[PDB]
Design a protein that fits this description.
CATH superfamily of chain A: Alpha/Beta hydrolase fold, catalytic domain
Protein name (chains A, B): Proline iminopeptidase
Family (chains A, B): Belongs to the peptidase S33 family.
Organism (chains A, B): Xanthomonas citri (Xanthomonas campestris pv. citri)
Strand order of the largest sheet of chain A: 1-2-4-3-5-6-7-8
CATH class of chain A: Alpha Beta
Strand content of chain A: 15-25%
Oligomer: homodimer
Order of helices and strands of chain A: EEEEHEHEHHHHHHHEHEH
CATH architecture of chain A: 3-Layer(aba) Sandwich
Main location (chains A, B): cytoplasm
Shape of chain A: globular
Subunit structure (chains A, B): Homooligomer.
Radius of gyration of chain A: 18 Å
Number of domains of chain A: 1
CATH topology of chain A: Rossmann fold
Structural class of chain A: alpha/beta
Largest interface: A-B, 20 and 21 residues
Number of strands of chain A: 8
Chain lengths: 313, 313
């Protein structure tokens, strides 16, 4: 069973003014002349972390990472203006074009997989391979599974906390009930909601509950951009033309090699979506983790991913 | 079959400052020393009309009417700040107290029946009789029936127009999708949504589609307050503690005489609710209109109401 490569530090860090309002933070790790790869974090609004630098062999890969609009160390933090799927797809191109690469491997998990697919289907010719994890297709049943009813059945105990953040009579469409609070003018009001919404994902992303992950998720500065940008994208349905758009346009990525790693007990994004993606994109290798959850840092998911990365290097 | 009394003008018109922000328009018609009755308009956000002065005998009734917060000729127009069921319940008391009446007949239809009930349950003692029509209990199935799916089956043709206002990916919870638009900063956006939302209740309020009613419902000024105030109360679930509050507390109006007039083919507020109220408050007389719709200006409805009014006079 493979593990993450050793802790590394970017040989270059910077900023890219994508438009007159958003400035993205980017960085590069590994071999400056190695095989190019762009890291797409989840959330949306989560931002990359140091651990995300370790999925690729720094000898063979030129690892490119960056924070998506209003996410992490990109400004303005938690901004919902012009923070849309097709904007993020254009940004990936601005970066690519800016760094001088023609084609590159797209690595993404959770929302990252949603962005990787949207990006690849919009720009097939600039994608060498796709390394997806914890597939999220953003169809309403997926959103509702996590935020309305579904995982609530396995995590009743944690669910009570998410629920309590909303008054009984508004509990019929929890996502919008949260949107009204995460968008409130009162800072206290949107904070209580952002923490409740953020923790929930923190409490259900690993087969075994990770106390530090939960806690890191109730951090007011993280909670704010995560919950707001997450809920923002969900309430608007990913800005897709039609709910099943990623499946509908999957034919554009037909000849793009790739791996689909997904944990069987992933209650954040059910295996269902990886199954459906697989049937629509046969050329990819579905690798199901027998006893893992959503997170990319589950031993089996890490193993599968590192193997995947080495396989294309 | 009775009819509306003749066109009458108020002997007094005014304005009442209920709080440092809201100024309610009110007026009085009829016998200044007659039996007092307060008229609760529907919507919420509809505001009274000239026709509403005519359900009572101007020789026996002191008819009090008023526009509810942000509606009609109350200010500020279309206002959602401190526009809540309990504020409106308080206002009824301010008007009552200000006009020096001790107890009075509450007459309301559609949302008006909701207020009438909320009010009577909070202040049983100041109510002589209740004359309800088009029962609306605000439970979520009622909202979903009219704005998500139900009445859509009988009015396929009209519903296509309501639906077209929202992009397909957001059509899963139409009420919240309209709210985001009716709450937009962009005026053009909230206008388009306000008209679409307001026409829908116009095209379905009478058994026989009334072309003037629809047209009046697409008037920008009326559209804006109606839609925004209506949507605002629904998305928040009538600001009740629990969804079935009006049935829960129906015991408080046990000894209050009343009449429930409902149209069999009322597709805006299904006979369901009139049926359940009636089971919970036995003392009232249920009078179902055989071939009538929602509106109080349905021949059979007008007949039932006028007779009710005269019976209590």
């Amino acid at each position: 069973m493979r593990t993450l490569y050793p802790e590394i530090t970017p040989y270059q860090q910077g900023s890219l003014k994508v438009d007159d309002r958003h400035t993205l933070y980017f960085e590069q790790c590994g071999n400056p002349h190695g095989k190019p790869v762009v890291m797409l974090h989840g959330g949306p609004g989560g931002g990359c972390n140091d651990k995300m630098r370790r999925f690729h062999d720094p000898a063979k890969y030129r690892i490119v990472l960056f924070d998506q609009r209003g996410s992490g160390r990109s400004t303005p933090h938690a901004d919902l203006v012009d923070n849309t799927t097709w904007d993020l797809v254009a940004d990936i191109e601005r970066l690519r074009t800016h760094l001088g690469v023609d084609r590159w491997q797209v690595f993404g998990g959770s929302w990252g997989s949603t962005l990787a697919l949207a990006y690849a289907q919009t720009h097939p010719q600039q994608v060498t391979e796709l390394v997806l994890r914890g597939i999220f297709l953003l169809r309403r049943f997926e959103l509702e599974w996590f935020y309305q009813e579904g995982a609530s059945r396995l995590f009743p105990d944690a669910w009570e906390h998410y629920l309590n953040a909303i008054p009984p009579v508004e509990r019929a469409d929890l996502m919008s009930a949260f949107h009204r609070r995460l968008t409130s003018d009162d800072e206290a009001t949107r904070l209580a909601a952002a923490k409740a919404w953020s923790v929930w994902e923190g409490a259900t992303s690993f087969l075994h509950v990770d106390e530090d992950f939960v806690t890191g998720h109730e951090d007011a500065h993280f909670a704010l951009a995560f919950a707001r940008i997450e809920n923002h994208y969900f309430v608007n349905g990913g800005f897709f033309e039609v709910e099943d758009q990623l499946l509908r346009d999957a034919h554009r990525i037909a000849d793009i090699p790739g791996v689909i790693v997904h944990g069987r007990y992933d209650v954040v994004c059910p295996l269902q979506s990886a199954w459906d993606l697989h049937k629509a994109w046969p050329k990819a290798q579905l690798q199901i983790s027998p006893a893992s959850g959503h997170s990319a840092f589950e031993p089996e998911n890490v193993d599968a991913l590192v193997r995947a990365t080495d396989g294309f290097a």
